[PDB]
Amino acid sequence: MNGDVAGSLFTSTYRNVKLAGKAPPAANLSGTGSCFDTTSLSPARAGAHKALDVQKDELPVWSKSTLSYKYPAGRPNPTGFLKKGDGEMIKTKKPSPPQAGAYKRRENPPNTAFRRFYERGDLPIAVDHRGSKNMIAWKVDIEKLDYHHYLPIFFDGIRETQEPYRFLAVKGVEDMLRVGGSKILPVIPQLIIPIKTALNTRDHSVMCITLQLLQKLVLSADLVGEALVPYYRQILPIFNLYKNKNKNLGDGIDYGQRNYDCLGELIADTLALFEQKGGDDAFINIKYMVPTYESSV
Amino acid sequence: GPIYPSTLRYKDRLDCGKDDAFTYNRLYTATQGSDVWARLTVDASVRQSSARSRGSFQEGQAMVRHSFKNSGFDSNTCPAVLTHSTFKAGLYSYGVPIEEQHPITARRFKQKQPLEFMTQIRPHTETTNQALRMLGTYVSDQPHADRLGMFIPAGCPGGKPAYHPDVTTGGFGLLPTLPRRGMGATLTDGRNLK
Amino acid sequence: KLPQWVENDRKVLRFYGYFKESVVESNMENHRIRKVILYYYLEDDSMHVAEPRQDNSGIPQGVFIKRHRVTRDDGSFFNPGDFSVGDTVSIYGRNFYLVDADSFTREFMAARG
Amino acid sequence: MREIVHIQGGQCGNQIGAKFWEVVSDEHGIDPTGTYHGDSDLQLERINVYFNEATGGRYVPRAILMDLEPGTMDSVRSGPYGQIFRPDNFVFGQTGAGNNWAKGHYTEGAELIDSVLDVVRKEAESCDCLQGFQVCHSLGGGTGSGMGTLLISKIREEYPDRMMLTFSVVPSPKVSDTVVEPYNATLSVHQLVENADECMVLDNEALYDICFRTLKLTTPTFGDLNHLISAVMSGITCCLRFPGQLNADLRKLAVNLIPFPRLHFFMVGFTPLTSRGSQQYRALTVPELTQQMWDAKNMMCAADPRHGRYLTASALFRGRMSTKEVDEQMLNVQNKNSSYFVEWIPNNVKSSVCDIPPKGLKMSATFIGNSTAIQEMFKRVSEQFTAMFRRKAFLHWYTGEGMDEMEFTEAESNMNDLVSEYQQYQDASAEE
Amino acid sequence: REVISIHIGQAGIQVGNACWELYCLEHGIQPDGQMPSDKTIGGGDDAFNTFFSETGAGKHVPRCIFLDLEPTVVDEVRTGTYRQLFHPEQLISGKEDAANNFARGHYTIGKEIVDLALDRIRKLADNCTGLQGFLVFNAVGGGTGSGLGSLLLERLSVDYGKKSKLGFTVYPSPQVSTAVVEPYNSVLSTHSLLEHTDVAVMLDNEAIYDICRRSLDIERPTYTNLNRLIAQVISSLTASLRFDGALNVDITEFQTNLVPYPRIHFMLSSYAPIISAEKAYHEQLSVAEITNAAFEPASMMVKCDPRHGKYMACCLMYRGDVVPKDVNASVATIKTKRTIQFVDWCPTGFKCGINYQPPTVVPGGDLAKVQRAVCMISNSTAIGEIFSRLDHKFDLMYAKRAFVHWYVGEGMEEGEFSEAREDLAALEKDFEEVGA
Amino acid sequence: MFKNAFQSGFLSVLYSIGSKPLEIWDKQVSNGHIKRITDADIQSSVLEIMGQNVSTTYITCPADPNKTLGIKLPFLVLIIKNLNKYFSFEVQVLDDKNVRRRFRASNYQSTTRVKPFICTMPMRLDSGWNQIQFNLSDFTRRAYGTNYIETLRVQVHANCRIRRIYFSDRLYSEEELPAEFKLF
Numbered sequence A: 001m002n003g004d005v006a007g008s009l010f011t012s013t014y015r016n017v018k019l020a021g022k023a024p025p026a027a028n029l030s031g032t033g034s035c036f037d038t039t040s041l042s043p044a045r046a047g048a049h050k051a052l053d054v055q056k057d058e059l060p061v062w063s064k065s066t067l068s069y070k071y072p073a074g075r076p077n078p079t080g081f082l083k084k085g086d087g088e089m090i091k092t093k094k095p096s097p098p099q100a101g102a103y104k105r106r107e108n109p110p111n112t113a114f115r116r117f118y119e120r121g122d123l124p125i126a127v128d129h130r131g132s133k134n135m136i137a138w139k140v141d142i143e144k145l146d147y148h149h150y151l152p153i154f155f156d157g158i159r160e161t162q163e164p165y166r167f168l169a170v171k172g173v174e175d176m177l178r179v180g181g182s183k184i185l186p187v188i189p190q191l192i193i194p195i196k197t198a199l200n201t202r203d204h205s206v207m208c209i210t211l212q213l214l215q216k217l218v219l220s221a222d223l224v225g226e227a228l229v230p231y232y233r234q235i236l237p238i239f240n241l242y243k244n245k246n247k248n249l250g251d252g253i254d255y256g257q258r259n260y261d262c263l264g265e266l267i268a269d270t271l272a273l274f275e276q277k278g279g280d281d282a283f284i285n286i287k288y289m290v291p292t293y294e295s296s297v
Numbered sequence B: 001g002p003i004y005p006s007t008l009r010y011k012d013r014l015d016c017g018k019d020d021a022f023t024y025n026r027l028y029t030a031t032q033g034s035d036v037w038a039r040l041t042v043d044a045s046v047r048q049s050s051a052r053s054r055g056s057f058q059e060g061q062a063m064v065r066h067s068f069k070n071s072g073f074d075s076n077t078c079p080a081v082l083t084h085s086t087f088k089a090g091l092y093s094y095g096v097p098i099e100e101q102h103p104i105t106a107r108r109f110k111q112k113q114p115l116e117f118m119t120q121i122r123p124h125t126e127t128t129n130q131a132l133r134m135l136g137t138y139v140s141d142q143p144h145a146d147r148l149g150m151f152i153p154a155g156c157p158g159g160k161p162a163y164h165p166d167v168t169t170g171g172f173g174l175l176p177t178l179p180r181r182g183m184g185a186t187l188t189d190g191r192n193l194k
Numbered sequence C: 001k002l003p004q005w006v007e008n009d010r011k012v013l014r015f016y017g018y019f020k021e022s023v024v025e026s027n028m029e030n031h032r033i034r035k036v037i038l039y040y041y042l043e044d045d046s047m048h049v050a051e052p053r054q055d056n057s058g059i060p061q062g063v064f065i066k067r068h069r070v071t072r073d074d075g076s077f078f079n080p081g082d083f084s085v086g087d088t089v090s091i092y093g094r095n096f097y098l099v100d101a102d103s104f105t106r107e108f109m110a111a112r113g
Numbered sequence D: 001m002r003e004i005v006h007i008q009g010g011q012c013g014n015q016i017g018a019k020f021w022e023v024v025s026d027e028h029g030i031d032p033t034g035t036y037h038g039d040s041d042l043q044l045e046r047i048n049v050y051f052n053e054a055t056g057g058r059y060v061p062r063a064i065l066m067d068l069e070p071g072t073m074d075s076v077r078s079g080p081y082g083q084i085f086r087p088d089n090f091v092f093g094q095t096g097a098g099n100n101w102a103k104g105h106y107t108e109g110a111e112l113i114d115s116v117l118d119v120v121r122k123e124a125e126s127c128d129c130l131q132g133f134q135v136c137h138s139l140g141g142g143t144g145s146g147m148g149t150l151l152i153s154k155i156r157e158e159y160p161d162r163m164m165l166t167f168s169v170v171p172s173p174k175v176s177d178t179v180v181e182p183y184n185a186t187l188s189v190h191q192l193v194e195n196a197d198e199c200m201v202l203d204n205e206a207l208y209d210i211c212f213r214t215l216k217l218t219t220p221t222f223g224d225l226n227h228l229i230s231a232v233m234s235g236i237t238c239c240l241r242f243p244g245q246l247n248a249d250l251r252k253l254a255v256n257l258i259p260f261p262r263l264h265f266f267m268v269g270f271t272p273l274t275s276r277g278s279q280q281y282r283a284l285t286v287p288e289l290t291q292q293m294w295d296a297k298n299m300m301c302a303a304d305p306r307h308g309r310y311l312t313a314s315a316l317f318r319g320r321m322s323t324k325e326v327d328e329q330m331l332n333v334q335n336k337n338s339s340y341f342v343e344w345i346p347n348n349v350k351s352s353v354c355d356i357p358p359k360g361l362k363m364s365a366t367f368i369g370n371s372t373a374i375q376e377m378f379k380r381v382s383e384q385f386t387a388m389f390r391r392k393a394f395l396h397w398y399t400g401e402g403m404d405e406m407e408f409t410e411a412e413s414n415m416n417d418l419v420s421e422y423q424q425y426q427d428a429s430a431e432e
Numbered sequence E: 001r002e003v004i005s006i007h008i009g010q011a012g013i014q015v016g017n018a019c020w021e022l023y024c025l026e027h028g029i030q031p032d033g034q035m036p037s038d039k040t041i042g043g044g045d046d047a048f049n050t051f052f053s054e055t056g057a058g059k060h061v062p063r064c065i066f067l068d069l070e071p072t073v074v075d076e077v078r079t080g081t082y083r084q085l086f087h088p089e090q091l092i093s094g095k096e097d098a099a100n101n102f103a104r105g106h107y108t109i110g111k112e113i114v115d116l117a118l119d120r121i122r123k124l125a126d127n128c129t130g131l132q133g134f135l136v137f138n139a140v141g142g143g144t145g146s147g148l149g150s151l152l153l154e155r156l157s158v159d160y161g162k163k164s165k166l167g168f169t170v171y172p173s174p175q176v177s178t179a180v181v182e183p184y185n186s187v188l189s190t191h192s193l194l195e196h197t198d199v200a201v202m203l204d205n206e207a208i209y210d211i212c213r214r215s216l217d218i219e220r221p222t223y224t225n226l227n228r229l230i231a232q233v234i235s236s237l238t239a240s241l242r243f244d245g246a247l248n249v250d251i252t253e254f255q256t257n258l259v260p261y262p263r264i265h266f267m268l269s270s271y272a273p274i275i276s277a278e279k280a281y282h283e284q285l286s287v288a289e290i291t292n293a294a295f296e297p298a299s300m301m302v303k304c305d306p307r308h309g310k311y312m313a314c315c316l317m318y319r320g321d322v323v324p325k326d327v328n329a330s331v332a333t334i335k336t337k338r339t340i341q342f343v344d345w346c347p348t349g350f351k352c353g354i355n356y357q358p359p360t361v362v363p364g365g366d367l368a369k370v371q372r373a374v375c376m377i378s379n380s381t382a383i384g385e386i387f388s389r390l391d392h393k394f395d396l397m398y399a400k401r402a403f404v405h406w407y408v409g410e411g412m413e414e415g416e417f418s419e420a421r422e423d424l425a426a427l428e429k430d431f432e433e434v435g436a
Numbered sequence F: 001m002f003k004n005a006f007q008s009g010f011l012s013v014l015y016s017i018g019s020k021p022l023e024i025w026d027k028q029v030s031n032g033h034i035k036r037i038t039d040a041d042i043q044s045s046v047l048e049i050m051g052q053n054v055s056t057t058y059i060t061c062p063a064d065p066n067k068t069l070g071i072k073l074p075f076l077v078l079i080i081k082n083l084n085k086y087f088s089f090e091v092q093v094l095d096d097k098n099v100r101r102r103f104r105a106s107n108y109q110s111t112t113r114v115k116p117f118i119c120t121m122p123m124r125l126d127s128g129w130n131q132i133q134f135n136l137s138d139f140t141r142r143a144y145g146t147n148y149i150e151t152l153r154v155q156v157h158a159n160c161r162i163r164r165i166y167f168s169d170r171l172y173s174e175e176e177l178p179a180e181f182k183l184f
């Protein structure tokens, strides 16, 4: 429930990098080159989790003798032989799945269609650079632009973490969601892939921004809720992953409330907004995907 | 770095001497070592290093498989699962017969393990309830009991020798096949079939 | 001497036989007879049984057994000298009665004995 | 009372079902001509689950055979125990899928699925109380995947509350028959997750490894692998057909193995499996069965449990055994390997005992492993699928038959999010 | 599961009366047309049904037509050993030859023979019930094999469409050819054939010369020794349609698993083992070496070195004594090799095939009785070098407008020469871009 | 190249009036000739491309075969005079599924064939000078379900007189075209 999703971007980033003193994650800048020239498009995919763990020889061997798994005996080396007194030392003398990481951050190279269409320069986007949080100066009027061609472009740009790109993408999404009327319904089947790609990456800020954008997407329409129910199979898994992640203070007061960093309540609010909007036969799919959810009457 | 010039080829050291007589004059003077055995050890070391540089070669590139009659039809056949075997597990002899084995041995063998003892005493029984039924239900139990010193209370379960309808033991039994009481030689009586 | 599979590569034993099959209640008949042609390859000692596909019979006819080495119910495989005419052969729980033999088979057994 | 209807799809499903029927018929004592010749009355009370006594002591399997190449049904009819199948159950097309999932699901589906549905419906309504359908097929070819998945789905809306077993083999990298294996496999596993009650993951690579090392066989043709699969299915279904000290039917195993409806892929193992020469020198007690059962290399799929955690597990025991040995062995397995079982589910093992061992054996066991290591195989298939799909290789052989690249997109996306949920459920502590 | 074959040209007819002899020897059908009654070979009827049709009186007639324009090669088929085997209407001969002119046989002479050939093949297919798909034989360097050999294919495509058509063509050699105008015919035939046939297996006469001289040890290999190997290849690639096997493949498998893109259908045939009776039995033939013997460039039926190119997909047909385990073992080791390589986007490019019946030895032939054999059919990017050289030698002649007055003077114009040239250039670019 | 360029409403890749017009283009001439002469009807210097074989002599826009220029302009415009000879030109485009398509317009063919990689269409010319607009986006949207993103290369064949080949973003008319881009 934020009036402006982009109204806290720069403040939060600056606070994290300087005010809090926490080390800012500076990755996925490989191949970006400089400015004023196009980024070399890497063929890597952000959504895919190309972990592919390779335990070639540290896999413990099953022991039929004793049911406990045991590591293989060490290779005897010629450098270390049997010393004089080690015989008395011998008298005087646990496996696990390696990681199977699900909560680790997935890499997201800057190869979205938003970026390309931006350095090409066919987007009518400009920054007002006002005293308040920046708006978008639209060269062409928003109501008459083609949503079928531009909406998938901007939701694919949510995944950006680079400073000049993510703000523009989020603000454009905000502007068309606020302005668009009944023309969002026919294009909503095309918007599943970018939302899923933005959700698949395990970035905290990216998840928060895409959750807020989903809330305003379902909110700022007339009957879009009844069209998102068949597509719950590709959006709700991330909600299931991060539903219970929430900070607990025994008696302290949560100060970081004006910014929506903790996604634990954000997921609950998004699931609710899914429940009221298009509530006809909607609990069944959500409960099938998320088993821990409860009805909001 | 070989001490002896033996390792190098002919024209290799010839070209070396044409280019540099400098190395060409060490590889002869490298043998200045007083002890020949030490120089032989160094030669062994350099030969061993050269061998280590080379890679191993497997000798099983062409797999050879023996064929019974050298025909694909025969080789690819798997025998059909046709068995006239008895269905009861107890009929098979998985152990030495309990009769010859010593009485106290049978007693403590029962004491550690009742189950397979009951199965050996009751070869025809197939279900757990039948084997662990009673020492008095089967008439054949009494010889085993008084051979192994197991007391049998009187009138258990009944005096009249009977009461095992499922299992075919003693005089109460009939084969499920069509010529009951056995010995079927024609189609008229069934020929031991259904 | 040469390998068996090349000495007789196309030499094929071929016998004619039948086996009765008791059919059930029907105005047509009370029992039926199924003609079968039995093939035995001298190359790899592999059996083969097929039907001659009577014209108007409603039975699905054609090949009866895959052409493969059959195993008898008790043990060792079949032998060429176990296919006399007028004798009963037991294959896969069925009993075929050999009735007639091919001329090649006739002369081959005559040479064999 | 309870009835199991058997359906085979594709040629591989046909040989698998043929081997299953021969082994089951030998178990129940009926000869290749369809007449009972056994000696135990126990081979009669529960044969209605698989056979229908037609007339004059003739027993016919409750099986329906389905394929697209006449050679397959010619083979299954000609082979031993081939005349026991009723000819009306040989529902069959004419042209052939040709290893094309799109063809076998769209172009031949609409013409042949009517007759297979009619015959399976008639067979189901013939009996009294359906327990569930059992389907054997392959995930590599077209008719095995495309036709079988559509048939399974149609049976699903026709009979939603009935059980559904699925014995499906999956392609392997070291044993790769065709070229379009990932293309068919991804779509088949996409269709399987929503429709089938559960699927048991099989592959020829693990079977080959098992028969090479454990069986120590020299020339293990498809007959041996199909015999192993048939014995596995018989051990799975034994509790339905025979008395035991503790019973566990299909529904019992399904409810005890599936914690969430989307987790219905299991790895299976069988024991004992010993060499011919070493069979006489080893004894038959529960510990020997347990030791071979839990071996990671004994699994019949290419999903090593050492790479994941055991969510749930089953041990179906056949034979005259002691329950105390059973549960103490399983307790020892759980306690010693405490790091390979999921934390928030105590007592991850369900056990059952059956009193009828397989013919010629004193003791037998069957393992059903619901481990989260199948995501390895899923990712392995998905990476090949997306490697081929990125350059649109062989795509015209599917696009020109009615499909769109969209279908491939949601197929890979659902594979991805299924693997993601597996990753979620693998490492999740009891408290967060 | 029935297939009919059509033979076009003096080379096609000569290949036909070496494949049909092998087919007759395969099912025991004597040249008179009926099987002997005193003794039989093999077992299982309907095996011949995919090639022959029974008249109900113990007769078997092939499902083929020999098509040519000069009435001088069909006569020794009409008067040869197999006089009664072929039905008289099947053998079709014209009145005047096209005389090594693609344009002539395509437009002037071929228009009077295509109609009756289509009429005959229509009622040949009418007798059929489960027609798998046609398969052809012709030489693109020749005249009638190219002109009407393309017109008839076009009319078959417009008449049936979905029916598969296999093209077993003999392309001109890089350096050894018996004519001087063969580049023109080759280009003008490949341009039209590029979008009609579904399977196009390449062949080269002097490559077969080399393999016969080396493996078979024949110092003077004539055409009879050549077309006797193509017969074996065709039998091997259709052996799954006749006899049962552990792992069988039909034509649809070939189309699905060997054609990554619609215009990329050009396969490089190979065979193993090519051995003689002297060396057949001393060598212990096994799956591993025969599968290895099928991938070196020295045994490929076309001299197109696969080392330069990359294998997008490969196909294998095993016959004889082969189990599904050693084939996989050999495929694994071959994949581990580094001399050959596969394209990036295709991780697995093998379509294995296992059959049971060993190849049948022909009396008075070159090959010996071998208990197992491999017929490999690949698809590699190296084949771009063939068209790259044939196009260059075509341009060499076309720069002076040499011999064009014989084609244009017939009634065609110069535009289609250039469009065929640019189509071949586009094919070159297509083969180049897929290798990236 | 051309990725860092402004790429405005007009963008010229080759103009016959300059010191080194063929500065980025790579010459491939055999059995032909290339010249820079002045024609008799517009009194301006034009580039000469004539070859006995049309497929042999050509010039490609990027000199380096691996390297490709990127132009997002939908319309491509060529100014050529019809010599009543065989002439053709070929253009490569990039779609949103990241594959390379080719469009070849030939003067000596009749059929219009659509293929996954090459689309050949016939094209007709009048007697004298004429300009042609290609409209790459419309062709890509018609032949395939894709859309136009990038143009990778352009290549023109023999028997043509080329001058001021350029890209554009709109179907500019005679009146509103800038002075240097009209015909006369």
Ligand SMILES: Nc1nc2c(ncn2[C@@H]2O[C@H](COP(=O)(O)OP(=O)(O)OP(=O)(O)O)[C@@H](O)[C@H]2O)c(=O)[nH]1
Residues within 6 Å of the ligand: E009, E010, E011, E012, E014, E015, E069, E070, E097, E098, E099, E100, E101, E139, E141, E142, E143, E144, E145, E146, E170, E172, E177, E178, E179, E205, E223, E224, E226, E227
């Ligand atoms: N492999 C093989 N190729 C042959 C044989 N006979 C002819 N050829 C090829 O065929 C070419 C000659 O053309 P033809 O086969 O006669 O076809 P054509 O164009 O109709 O020529 P004509 O029959 O004279 O009208 C030669 O270049 C050979 O390469 C043969 O017996 N075996």
Ligand SMILES: Nc1nc2c(ncn2[C@@H]2O[C@H](COP(=O)(O)OP(=O)(O)O)[C@@H](O)[C@H]2O)c(=O)[nH]1
Residues within 6 Å of the ligand: D009, D010, D011, D012, D013, D015, D016, D097, D099, D138, D140, D141, D142, D143, D144, D145, D169, D175, D176, D177, D178, D204, D222, D223, D225, D226
């Ligand atoms: N276990 C087993 N696997 C088989 C058998 N036959 C084929 N396969 C496997 O099935 C895969 C190919 O399936 P396919 O023939 O295309 O099935 P289809 O869809 O019916 O055509 C191969 O990878 C084989 O390993 C068999 O008899 N037993």
Ligand SMILES: [Mg+2]
Residues within 6 Å of the ligand: E009, E010, E011, E070
């Ligand atoms: Mg000729």
